[PDB]
Structure 1
Amino acid sequence: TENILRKSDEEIQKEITARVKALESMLIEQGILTTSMIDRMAEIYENEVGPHLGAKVVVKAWTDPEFKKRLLADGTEACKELGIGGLQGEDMMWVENTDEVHHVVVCTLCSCYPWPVLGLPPNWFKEPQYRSRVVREPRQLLKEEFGFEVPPSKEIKVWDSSSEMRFVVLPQRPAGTDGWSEEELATLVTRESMIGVEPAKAV
Protein backbone atom coordinates (compact mmCIF):
# COMPACT_ATOMS: atom_id res chain seq x y z
CA THR A 1 0.00 0.00 0.00
CA GLU A 2 1.19 3.52 -0.80
CA ASN A 3 2.97 5.43 1.94
CA ILE A 4 4.30 8.85 0.95
CA LEU A 5 6.80 8.62 3.82
CA ARG A 6 8.48 5.44 2.58
CA LYS A 7 11.83 5.31 0.75
CA SER A 8 12.18 3.33 -2.48
CA ASP A 9 12.69 -0.44 -2.32
CA GLU A 10 16.20 0.11 -3.73
CA GLU A 11 17.16 2.56 -0.96
CA ILE A 12 15.65 0.29 1.69
CA GLN A 13 17.63 -2.70 0.40
CA LYS A 14 20.86 -0.67 0.29
CA GLU A 15 20.43 0.45 3.91
CA ILE A 16 19.53 -3.01 5.21
CA THR A 17 22.46 -4.58 3.36
CA ALA A 18 24.92 -2.23 5.07
CA ARG A 19 23.32 -2.73 8.49
CA VAL A 20 23.36 -6.52 8.18
CA LYS A 21 26.97 -6.65 6.95
CA ALA A 22 27.96 -4.44 9.90
CA LEU A 23 26.22 -6.67 12.45
CA GLU A 24 27.61 -9.75 10.71
CA SER A 25 31.16 -8.38 10.98
CA MET A 26 30.72 -7.98 14.74
CA LEU A 27 29.23 -11.43 15.35
CA ILE A 28 32.07 -12.89 13.28
CA GLU A 29 34.65 -11.13 15.48
CA GLN A 30 32.88 -12.51 18.57
CA GLY A 31 33.46 -15.98 17.14
CA ILE A 32 29.77 -16.92 17.24
CA LEU A 33 29.04 -16.65 13.51
CA THR A 34 31.03 -17.96 10.53
CA THR A 35 30.60 -18.11 6.76
CA SER A 36 30.23 -21.90 6.84
CA MET A 37 27.48 -21.67 9.48
CA ILE A 38 25.59 -19.21 7.29
CA ASP A 39 25.98 -21.37 4.19
CA ARG A 40 24.88 -24.52 6.03
CA MET A 41 21.63 -22.98 7.35
CA ALA A 42 20.81 -21.61 3.89
CA GLU A 43 21.56 -24.91 2.13
CA ILE A 44 19.26 -26.83 4.47
CA TYR A 45 16.24 -24.61 3.83
CA GLU A 46 16.87 -24.03 0.14
CA ASN A 47 17.32 -27.67 -0.86
CA GLU A 48 16.82 -30.12 2.03
CA VAL A 49 13.76 -29.06 4.03
CA GLY A 50 10.62 -28.17 2.10
CA PRO A 51 6.92 -28.94 1.38
CA HIS A 52 7.86 -32.16 -0.42
CA LEU A 53 8.31 -33.62 3.07
CA GLY A 54 4.80 -32.68 4.16
CA ALA A 55 3.53 -34.12 0.87
CA LYS A 56 5.04 -37.50 1.78
CA VAL A 57 3.17 -37.47 5.09
CA VAL A 58 -0.09 -36.48 3.40
CA VAL A 59 0.06 -39.23 0.76
CA LYS A 60 0.91 -41.86 3.39
CA ALA A 61 -2.13 -40.76 5.43
CA TRP A 62 -4.26 -40.89 2.27
CA THR A 63 -3.10 -44.44 1.50
CA ASP A 64 -2.74 -45.82 5.04
CA PRO A 65 -5.74 -45.48 7.43
CA GLU A 66 -3.68 -46.69 10.39
CA PHE A 67 -0.90 -44.17 9.79
CA LYS A 68 -3.55 -41.45 9.39
CA LYS A 69 -4.93 -42.35 12.82
CA ARG A 70 -1.44 -42.09 14.31
CA LEU A 71 -0.83 -38.81 12.48
CA LEU A 72 -3.96 -37.19 13.90
CA ALA A 73 -3.22 -38.65 17.35
CA ASP A 74 0.37 -37.39 17.59
CA GLY A 75 1.75 -35.47 14.62
CA THR A 76 5.34 -35.30 15.87
CA GLU A 77 5.63 -39.03 16.55
CA ALA A 78 3.87 -40.00 13.32
CA CYS A 79 6.11 -37.78 11.18
CA LYS A 80 9.17 -39.28 12.90
CA GLU A 81 8.21 -42.62 11.30
CA LEU A 82 9.23 -41.01 8.00
CA GLY A 83 12.34 -39.39 9.46
CA ILE A 84 10.61 -36.01 9.38
CA GLY A 85 10.82 -33.56 12.28
CA GLY A 86 12.99 -31.04 14.08
CA LEU A 87 13.35 -27.27 14.38
CA GLN A 88 10.00 -25.47 14.66
CA GLY A 89 8.08 -28.71 14.29
CA GLU A 90 8.91 -30.27 17.66
CA ASP A 91 5.19 -30.28 18.44
CA MET A 92 2.91 -30.83 15.47
CA MET A 93 -0.85 -31.24 15.41
CA TRP A 94 -2.38 -32.27 12.11
CA VAL A 95 -6.01 -31.42 11.39
CA GLU A 96 -8.17 -33.24 8.84
CA ASN A 97 -10.26 -31.49 6.18
CA THR A 98 -13.62 -33.19 5.54
CA ASP A 99 -16.89 -32.53 3.71
CA GLU A 100 -18.12 -30.75 6.84
CA VAL A 101 -14.99 -28.92 8.02
CA HIS A 102 -12.23 -26.84 6.47
CA HIS A 103 -9.06 -25.92 8.37
CA VAL A 104 -6.70 -22.99 7.83
CA VAL A 105 -3.61 -22.05 9.85
CA VAL A 106 -2.05 -18.74 10.85
CA CYS A 107 0.32 -17.09 13.30
CA THR A 108 -1.41 -13.80 14.07
CA LEU A 109 1.33 -12.86 16.52
CA CYS A 110 4.30 -13.36 14.17
CA SER A 111 5.04 -16.12 11.61
CA CYS A 112 5.00 -19.52 13.34
CA TYR A 113 4.99 -22.30 10.74
CA PRO A 114 5.85 -26.06 10.69
CA TRP A 115 9.36 -25.88 9.21
CA PRO A 116 10.07 -29.66 9.25
CA VAL A 117 7.19 -30.43 6.88
CA LEU A 118 6.78 -27.21 4.88
CA GLY A 119 10.16 -25.51 5.04
CA LEU A 120 10.26 -21.75 5.66
CA PRO A 121 6.94 -19.91 5.14
CA PRO A 122 6.25 -17.81 2.04
CA ASN A 123 6.35 -14.07 2.64
CA TRP A 124 2.57 -13.52 2.45
CA PHE A 125 2.05 -15.89 5.40
CA LYS A 126 4.41 -13.79 7.53
CA GLU A 127 2.84 -10.48 6.50
CA PRO A 128 0.15 -8.42 8.34
CA GLN A 129 -2.45 -8.66 5.57
CA TYR A 130 -3.06 -12.41 5.77
CA ARG A 131 -2.42 -12.63 9.51
CA SER A 132 -4.89 -9.90 10.43
CA ARG A 133 -7.74 -10.97 8.19
CA VAL A 134 -7.81 -14.78 8.26
CA VAL A 135 -9.15 -15.03 11.83
CA ARG A 136 -11.88 -12.45 11.10
CA GLU A 137 -13.00 -12.99 7.47
CA PRO A 138 -11.61 -16.44 6.56
CA ARG A 139 -14.34 -17.23 4.02
CA GLN A 140 -13.95 -13.93 2.14
CA LEU A 141 -10.15 -14.12 2.27
CA LEU A 142 -10.03 -17.63 0.80
CA LYS A 143 -12.37 -16.57 -2.01
CA GLU A 144 -10.83 -13.19 -2.84
CA GLU A 145 -7.15 -14.06 -2.47
CA PHE A 146 -7.01 -17.76 -3.33
CA GLY A 147 -10.11 -18.18 -5.49
CA PHE A 148 -11.19 -20.86 -3.03
CA GLU A 149 -14.94 -20.77 -2.35
CA VAL A 150 -15.99 -22.54 0.84
CA PRO A 151 -19.82 -22.91 1.06
CA PRO A 152 -21.42 -20.91 3.93
CA SER A 153 -22.79 -24.13 5.43
CA LYS A 154 -19.28 -25.61 5.73
CA GLU A 155 -17.45 -24.68 8.93
CA ILE A 156 -14.09 -22.97 8.68
CA LYS A 157 -11.79 -23.61 11.63
CA VAL A 158 -8.88 -21.18 11.86
CA TRP A 159 -5.89 -22.35 13.92
CA ASP A 160 -3.78 -19.60 15.47
CA SER A 161 -0.31 -20.82 16.48
CA SER A 162 0.08 -18.84 19.71
CA SER A 163 2.19 -21.59 21.30
CA GLU A 164 4.92 -23.95 20.14
CA MET A 165 2.25 -26.32 18.86
CA ARG A 166 2.44 -26.24 15.06
CA PHE A 167 -0.79 -26.85 13.17
CA VAL A 168 -0.72 -28.55 9.76
CA VAL A 169 -3.68 -29.26 7.48
CA LEU A 170 -4.29 -32.72 6.03
CA PRO A 171 -6.22 -31.84 2.85
CA GLN A 172 -8.95 -34.10 1.50
CA ARG A 173 -7.89 -36.51 -1.21
CA PRO A 174 -9.08 -35.18 -4.61
CA ALA A 175 -11.68 -37.21 -6.48
CA GLY A 176 -10.64 -39.35 -9.43
CA THR A 177 -7.45 -40.60 -7.78
CA ASP A 178 -8.51 -44.13 -6.85
CA GLY A 179 -5.55 -46.51 -6.78
CA TRP A 180 -2.96 -43.85 -7.61
CA SER A 181 0.60 -44.43 -6.40
CA GLU A 182 2.03 -42.32 -3.58
CA GLU A 183 4.32 -40.63 -6.13
CA GLU A 184 1.36 -39.69 -8.34
CA LEU A 185 -0.72 -38.50 -5.37
CA ALA A 186 2.19 -36.32 -4.18
CA THR A 187 1.89 -34.17 -7.33
CA LEU A 188 -1.47 -32.97 -5.99
CA VAL A 189 -0.23 -31.94 -2.54
CA THR A 190 0.86 -28.31 -2.32
CA ARG A 191 2.25 -26.10 0.41
CA GLU A 192 -1.01 -24.13 0.14
CA SER A 193 -3.12 -27.26 0.72
CA MET A 194 -1.23 -27.92 3.96
CA ILE A 195 -1.74 -24.33 5.17
CA GLY A 196 -5.42 -24.60 4.27
CA VAL A 197 -5.60 -21.63 1.87
CA GLU A 198 -6.27 -23.94 -1.08
CA PRO A 199 -7.50 -27.52 -1.47
CA ALA A 200 -5.22 -30.21 -2.92
CA LYS A 201 -4.88 -30.09 -6.73
CA ALA A 202 -7.97 -31.28 -8.61
CA VAL A 203 -7.80 -34.01 -11.27
Structure 2
Amino acid sequence: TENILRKSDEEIQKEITARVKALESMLIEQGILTTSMIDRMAEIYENEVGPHLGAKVVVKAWTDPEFKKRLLADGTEACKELGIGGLQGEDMMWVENTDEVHHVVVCTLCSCYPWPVLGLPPNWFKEPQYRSRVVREPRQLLKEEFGFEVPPSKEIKVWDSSSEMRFVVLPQRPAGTDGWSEEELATLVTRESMIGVEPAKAVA
Protein backbone atom coordinates (compact mmCIF):
# COMPACT_ATOMS: atom_id res chain seq x y z
CA THR A 1 0.00 0.00 0.00
CA GLU A 2 1.16 3.53 -0.81
CA ASN A 3 2.81 5.40 2.01
CA ILE A 4 3.90 8.86 0.87
CA LEU A 5 6.33 8.93 3.79
CA ARG A 6 8.26 5.83 2.76
CA LYS A 7 11.71 5.73 1.12
CA SER A 8 12.26 3.63 -1.99
CA ASP A 9 12.91 -0.09 -1.53
CA GLU A 10 16.46 0.38 -2.87
CA GLU A 11 17.20 3.12 -0.36
CA ILE A 12 15.73 0.99 2.43
CA GLN A 13 17.88 -2.00 1.43
CA LYS A 14 20.97 0.19 1.36
CA GLU A 15 20.37 1.55 4.85
CA ILE A 16 19.60 -1.87 6.32
CA THR A 17 22.65 -3.39 4.71
CA ALA A 18 24.93 -0.81 6.35
CA ARG A 19 23.18 -1.16 9.70
CA VAL A 20 23.50 -4.94 9.68
CA LYS A 21 27.13 -4.98 8.54
CA ALA A 22 27.95 -2.55 11.36
CA LEU A 23 26.19 -4.69 14.00
CA GLU A 24 27.83 -7.77 12.52
CA SER A 25 31.27 -6.22 12.86
CA MET A 26 30.65 -5.50 16.54
CA LEU A 27 29.34 -8.99 17.36
CA ILE A 28 32.31 -10.45 15.49
CA GLU A 29 34.73 -8.43 17.63
CA GLN A 30 32.95 -9.64 20.76
CA GLY A 31 33.78 -13.16 19.62
CA ILE A 32 30.18 -14.35 19.59
CA LEU A 33 29.53 -14.35 15.85
CA THR A 34 31.64 -15.77 13.03
CA THR A 35 31.31 -16.09 9.27
CA SER A 36 31.19 -19.89 9.50
CA MET A 37 28.31 -19.69 12.02
CA ILE A 38 26.38 -17.48 9.63
CA ASP A 39 27.03 -19.73 6.66
CA ARG A 40 25.98 -22.87 8.59
CA MET A 41 22.64 -21.42 9.72
CA ALA A 42 21.92 -20.30 6.17
CA GLU A 43 22.85 -23.63 4.67
CA ILE A 44 20.59 -25.51 7.08
CA TYR A 45 17.43 -23.57 6.21
CA GLU A 46 18.17 -23.14 2.52
CA ASN A 47 18.95 -26.79 1.85
CA GLU A 48 18.41 -29.18 4.77
CA VAL A 49 15.25 -28.15 6.60
CA GLY A 50 12.17 -27.46 4.51
CA PRO A 51 8.58 -28.50 3.73
CA HIS A 52 9.72 -31.74 2.08
CA LEU A 53 10.13 -32.98 5.66
CA GLY A 54 6.53 -32.15 6.60
CA ALA A 55 5.41 -33.89 3.41
CA LYS A 56 7.07 -37.15 4.47
CA VAL A 57 5.17 -36.97 7.74
CA VAL A 58 1.91 -36.29 5.95
CA VAL A 59 2.26 -39.19 3.49
CA LYS A 60 3.18 -41.58 6.31
CA ALA A 61 0.04 -40.52 8.19
CA TRP A 62 -1.91 -40.92 4.94
CA THR A 63 -0.61 -44.45 4.42
CA ASP A 64 -0.27 -45.63 8.03
CA PRO A 65 -3.33 -45.27 10.32
CA GLU A 66 -1.37 -46.22 13.42
CA PHE A 67 1.29 -43.60 12.72
CA LYS A 68 -1.47 -41.08 12.09
CA LYS A 69 -2.94 -41.82 15.52
CA ARG A 70 0.47 -41.33 17.11
CA LEU A 71 0.97 -38.17 15.05
CA LEU A 72 -2.30 -36.69 16.28
CA ALA A 73 -1.60 -37.82 19.86
CA ASP A 74 1.95 -36.43 20.20
CA GLY A 75 3.28 -34.64 17.14
CA THR A 76 6.84 -34.10 18.32
CA GLU A 77 7.35 -37.70 19.35
CA ALA A 78 5.79 -39.01 16.12
CA CYS A 79 7.91 -36.84 13.82
CA LYS A 80 10.98 -38.06 15.67
CA GLU A 81 10.16 -41.52 14.30
CA LEU A 82 11.20 -40.07 10.97
CA GLY A 83 14.25 -38.30 12.40
CA ILE A 84 12.42 -34.98 12.14
CA GLY A 85 12.38 -32.35 14.88
CA GLY A 86 14.36 -29.66 16.61
CA LEU A 87 14.40 -25.89 16.73
CA GLN A 88 10.93 -24.28 16.85
CA GLY A 89 9.23 -27.66 16.63
CA GLU A 90 10.00 -28.96 20.11
CA ASP A 91 6.24 -29.07 20.78
CA MET A 92 4.24 -29.85 17.66
CA MET A 93 0.51 -30.50 17.63
CA TRP A 94 -0.88 -31.75 14.34
CA VAL A 95 -4.55 -31.17 13.48
CA GLU A 96 -6.50 -33.24 10.95
CA ASN A 97 -8.61 -31.75 8.12
CA THR A 98 -11.80 -33.72 7.50
CA ASP A 99 -15.07 -33.32 5.60
CA GLU A 100 -16.44 -31.58 8.68
CA VAL A 101 -13.44 -29.45 9.70
CA HIS A 102 -10.85 -27.23 8.09
CA HIS A 103 -7.83 -26.04 10.08
CA VAL A 104 -5.66 -23.00 9.40
CA VAL A 105 -2.67 -21.82 11.43
CA VAL A 106 -1.37 -18.32 12.25
CA CYS A 107 0.87 -16.42 14.61
CA THR A 108 -1.05 -13.18 15.18
CA LEU A 109 1.52 -11.87 17.63
CA CYS A 110 4.59 -12.45 15.49
CA SER A 111 5.66 -15.23 13.14
CA CYS A 112 5.76 -18.57 15.02
CA TYR A 113 5.96 -21.49 12.61
CA PRO A 114 6.96 -25.16 12.77
CA TRP A 115 10.53 -24.91 11.39
CA PRO A 116 11.50 -28.59 11.63
CA VAL A 117 8.72 -29.73 9.24
CA LEU A 118 8.17 -26.63 7.11
CA GLY A 119 11.44 -24.71 7.27
CA LEU A 120 11.26 -20.94 7.67
CA PRO A 121 7.89 -19.31 6.92
CA PRO A 122 7.24 -17.46 3.63
CA ASN A 123 7.13 -13.71 4.08
CA TRP A 124 3.34 -13.42 3.70
CA PHE A 125 2.86 -15.64 6.77
CA LYS A 126 4.96 -13.27 8.87
CA GLU A 127 3.35 -10.13 7.52
CA PRO A 128 0.51 -8.13 9.17
CA GLN A 129 -2.02 -8.60 6.38
CA TYR A 130 -2.45 -12.36 6.74
CA ARG A 131 -1.96 -12.31 10.53
CA SER A 132 -4.58 -9.61 11.18
CA ARG A 133 -7.27 -11.01 8.92
CA VAL A 134 -7.15 -14.80 9.21
CA VAL A 135 -8.52 -14.93 12.80
CA ARG A 136 -11.30 -12.51 11.88
CA GLU A 137 -12.42 -13.55 8.37
CA PRO A 138 -10.78 -16.88 7.63
CA ARG A 139 -13.45 -17.97 5.18
CA GLN A 140 -13.19 -14.83 3.04
CA LEU A 141 -9.41 -14.74 3.28
CA LEU A 142 -9.10 -18.31 2.05
CA LYS A 143 -11.38 -17.56 -0.88
CA GLU A 144 -10.07 -14.12 -1.82
CA GLU A 145 -6.34 -14.66 -1.37
CA PHE A 146 -5.91 -18.39 -1.95
CA GLY A 147 -8.80 -19.25 -4.30
CA PHE A 148 -9.92 -21.70 -1.65
CA GLU A 149 -13.66 -21.97 -1.01
CA VAL A 150 -14.63 -23.52 2.32
CA PRO A 151 -18.43 -24.10 2.34
CA PRO A 152 -20.10 -21.98 5.08
CA SER A 153 -21.46 -25.14 6.68
CA LYS A 154 -17.94 -26.49 7.11
CA GLU A 155 -16.33 -25.43 10.39
CA ILE A 156 -13.10 -23.46 10.16
CA LYS A 157 -10.75 -23.70 13.09
CA VAL A 158 -8.03 -21.05 13.30
CA TRP A 159 -5.02 -21.98 15.42
CA ASP A 160 -3.15 -18.95 16.79
CA SER A 161 0.26 -19.99 18.08
CA SER A 162 0.57 -17.74 21.13
CA SER A 163 2.78 -20.30 22.90
CA GLU A 164 5.67 -22.58 22.04
CA MET A 165 3.12 -25.15 20.87
CA ARG A 166 3.47 -25.31 17.10
CA PHE A 167 0.38 -26.28 15.12
CA VAL A 168 0.60 -28.17 11.83
CA VAL A 169 -2.28 -29.08 9.53
CA LEU A 170 -2.60 -32.63 8.26
CA PRO A 171 -4.35 -32.00 4.96
CA GLN A 172 -6.97 -34.39 3.67
CA ARG A 173 -5.72 -36.94 1.17
CA PRO A 174 -6.84 -35.96 -2.35
CA ALA A 175 -9.37 -38.18 -4.12
CA GLY A 176 -8.02 -40.40 -6.89
CA THR A 177 -4.80 -41.38 -5.10
CA ASP A 178 -5.68 -44.90 -3.95
CA GLY A 179 -2.58 -47.04 -3.62
CA TRP A 180 -0.16 -44.31 -4.67
CA SER A 181 3.37 -44.65 -3.37
CA GLU A 182 4.64 -42.36 -0.61
CA GLU A 183 6.86 -40.53 -3.12
CA GLU A 184 3.94 -40.00 -5.51
CA LEU A 185 1.68 -38.76 -2.68
CA ALA A 186 4.41 -36.38 -1.47
CA THR A 187 4.13 -34.43 -4.73
CA LEU A 188 0.64 -33.42 -3.58
CA VAL A 189 1.71 -32.07 -0.20
CA THR A 190 2.61 -28.36 -0.11
CA ARG A 191 3.76 -26.00 2.61
CA GLU A 192 0.43 -24.19 2.02
CA SER A 193 -1.55 -27.40 2.62
CA MET A 194 0.19 -27.83 5.99
CA ILE A 195 -0.55 -24.21 6.98
CA GLY A 196 -4.15 -24.80 5.95
CA VAL A 197 -4.42 -21.94 3.45
CA GLU A 198 -4.81 -24.43 0.61
CA PRO A 199 -5.85 -28.07 0.28
CA ALA A 200 -3.34 -30.67 -0.89
CA LYS A 201 -3.03 -30.73 -4.69
CA ALA A 202 -5.85 -32.34 -6.68
CA VAL A 203 -4.62 -35.12 -8.98
CA ALA A 204 -5.72 -33.35 -12.20
Aligning the two structures, in what range does the TM-score lie when normalised by the shorter sequence?
Answer: over 0.9
**In structure 1, what is the Cα distance between the partners aligned to 2:11 and 2:51?**
33
TM-superposition CA deviations, 1:1-30 (whole Å, max 9, x none): 000000000000000000000000000000
Q: Deviations over 1:139-165 (max 9, x none)?
A: 000000000000000000000000000
Q: Distance in 1 between matches of 2:62 and 2:81?
A: 15
Q: Partners of 1:117 and 1:43 in 2: how far apart? A: 16
| Alpha-carbon shift at residue 112 of structure 1 (Å) | 0.1
Scaled by the length of structure 1, the TM-score of the pair is 1.00
TM-score (norm 2): 0.99
| 1:188 Cα offset (Å) | 0.1
What displacement does 1:126 show? 0.1
CA separation in 1, counterparts of 2:178 and 2:82?
A: 23
SS of 1:141's partner is helix
Offset at residue 179 of structure 1 (A): 0.2
Spell out structure 1 runs of 4+ moving beyond 2 A: none
Q: Supply the distance in 2 between the matched residues of 1:119 and 1:33 (Cα, whole angstroms).
A: 23
Structure 1 residues 29-57: Cα deviation after superposition (integer angstroms, max 9, x where no partner): 00000000000000000000000000000
Aligned-pair distance for 1:120? Answer: 0.1
1:3 aligns with 2:3: yes
Aligned to 1:63: 63
Per-residue CA deviation, residues 114-143 of structure 1 (Å, 9 max, x unaligned), is 000000000000000000000000000000
2 CA distance for matches of 1:185 and 1:168? 18
**Alpha-carbon distance in 2 for matches of 1:103, 1:134:** 11
CA–CA distance in 2 between the matches of 1:46 and 1:167?
Answer: 22
| Partners of 1:70 and 1:85 in 2: CA distance | 15
Q: Which runs of 5+ in 2 are unaligned?
A: none
In the alignment, the residues of structure 2 paired with residue 4 and residue 183 of structure 1 have an alpha-carbon distance, to the nearest angstrom, of 50
**Ranges in structure 1 where 5+ consecutive residues have no aligned partner:** none
Question: What is the match of residue 35 of structure 1?
Answer: 35
The separation in 2 between residues aligned to 1:179 and 1:199, in whole angstroms, is 20
> d(CA) in 2 for partners of 1:156 and 1:146?
15
Residue-by-residue CA offset, 1:87-133 (whole Å, 9 max, x unaligned): 00000000000000000000000000000000000000000000000
Distance of 1:57 and 1:121 partners within structure 2: 18
Measured against aligned partners, the alpha-carbon deviations of 1:55-78 in whole angstroms (never above 9, x if no partner) come to 000000000000000000000000
Give the count of matched residue pairs.
203
Provide the C-alpha distance between the structure 1 equivalents of 2:125 and 2:16, rounded to a whole number of angstroms.
22
CA distance in 2, matches of 1:10, 1:115: 30
Distance 1:181 1:116 in 2: 23
Query: In the aligned structure 2, how far is the partner of 1:172 from the partner of 1:137?
Result: 22
- Give distance in 1, aligned partners of 2:195 and 2:91: 16
The alpha carbon displacement at 1:170 in A equals 0.0
Give 1:44's aligned residue: 44
2:47 & 2:80 partners in 1: Cα distance?
Answer: 20
